[model samples]
Target: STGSATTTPIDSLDDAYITPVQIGTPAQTLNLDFDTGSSDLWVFSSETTASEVXQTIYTPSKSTTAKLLSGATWSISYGDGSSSSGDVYTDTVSVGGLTVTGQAVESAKKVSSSFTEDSTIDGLLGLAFSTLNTVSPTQQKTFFDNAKASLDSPVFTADLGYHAPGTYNFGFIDTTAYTGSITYTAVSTKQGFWEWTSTGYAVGSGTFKSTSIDGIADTGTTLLYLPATVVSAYWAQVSGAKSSSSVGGYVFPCSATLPSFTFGVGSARIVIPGDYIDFGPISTGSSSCFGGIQSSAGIGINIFGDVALKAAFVVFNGATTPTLGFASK
Candidate 1:
């Protein structure tokens, strides 16, 4: 069996993409971020703190199939230091039309202020490998992992969009969703991430650099975090571009026509439109716009977020050997 879901940006900048997921017997639906960067299917629930505002919460009591995973608990932390911890329960979960029984659902009893302020998201359904799951006493498999056995193709694809609706497909690849042949590359799951080495990058119409830059495809992240050298070189070509610590990261004139960014995956190269780099004005009437590309200096690792994912069709193949396939849309 296969599943398909609509991925809609939570905000104008596409900071986070959310999809509808159904949990429990009666199907309590919630908008969740299908984050490929981490592994943990957590949700806001009646168990969530009263501090929670402007968000829906799931009530296990309403579901006859909801069963507490006796003595099990789970917790998750983010790079930004935000975190959440909760009780674990097993219940039927569904994404699009795909269903999984006895799926681990971490019921958030407490969530960080950052998550609480996110009025648009109810929770996150992690798509990363289950090795990163935080459930204790017994490590639980992610929704994707749990559904893998019943999947028709043991594969999934992310068609992240540009300020528009995209799709997240499970089990089968949508042939019509992309153009040209796919360029598949080996991904190192050493870090429990879909990490891969990019062949190189080019700024605008510049010559391609054959440097091997290692990074991960993180749908959970907001921007592209690359080496300082690449980021500096890219912005340097644009007039009025500044590495302003005051405003954070690189910023340039809103009117400046940025050069497109190109990165290689095997023999194929994907181009990120210049217009996509301009995240938007810093403030209400500010003239300086923040760049979608930023330095990975202190990030410890590079992340290819929506800014990069939206450029092409990405396949996260969970077949016999893990591989990432990139194709032009």
Candidate 2:
């Protein structure tokens, strides 16, 4: 799609930002994280070892409203080495006014510190394209996959708000949900993800001479990951930008005047923001570690993370076109 052929509307509240919105009334309440990074929905069950900091776990036995999936397994891992693996079951997963019945739910047994420490979120609901589905070899339908048939459009659009946090809504796009002018690039199905090839890649304010690089639009990854060439080329422009022994990646100044980073997706030029350069500060070892853009190997999968998605509203339509819609939200 050249641009958003269409747009949709959505709603919200301050308290609505609850980590896990109670899915089934007061009965079977499951806490979940609305993650745009992946495309599956699973829950942390009471069966999990409770942590003081972790979000509340859902007990299927606690509510007569929930149903359990008997013999399925689910597993997930993050770049930080945190992981969650367990059995899969179906239940009623709901958000806002949307309720998805018989949704795939996972009960985690093993999890990493990344998950344990960031215990604010109970479970992760991956809303990325088809790339991050936590499904097995024989499993074909995800929660969204099973619910797509009931949706108005086969598309799910997320509006990462301007003044505050981001959001997730199904089957529609809410243009009013964001602030800046929305930009878009069509989705590419290559490599199993709704991947969109970039026109070019860069870091900080320095411009890399390269015009194109291999990367995917991934919501599952929290940070931007590119080839080593792209990361090196970007920090090369920053006088102080360099790899840090204190951090796993490179670091740079947030006040640094960065380059105009643009990616050409198909015929569209998707421009990334300078704010992304200031991405991890204050918390991670290197505040501006990798300056929001990092490098990853071992797995050839290059990801354009939430920062990229926040720049644009991606719609994955599995219906008639089976296409990915990239547009400014």
The digit string of per-residue lDDT tens for model 2 on 194-292 reads: 665566654434453546666665655556677887777766777778887677777776557665455555555456776655554535443353466
lDDT agreement with native, every candidate:
0.93, 0.59
Instruction: Please count the clashing residue pairs in each candidate, in the order shown.
Output: 0, 17
Task: Output the lDDT of residue 224, model 2.
Answer: 69
Q: After best superposition, candidate 1 residue 320: deviation in angstroms?
A: 3.3
| Model 2, residue 123: C-alpha shift (Å) | 0.5
Give the Å shift of residue 84 in candidate 2.
2.0
lDDT, model 1, position 49: 85
- Tell me each candidate's RMSD, in Å, in order: 0.8, 5.7
lDDT of 1 at 108: 97
Identify the leading candidate in terms of lDDT: 1
Sequence-dependent TM-score of model 2: 0.78
Top TM-score hit: 1
Please report, as a residue range, the 10-residue window in candidate 2 with the lowest summed lDDT. Answer: 1-10
Instruction: Give residue 187's error in model 1 in angstroms.
Output: 1.0
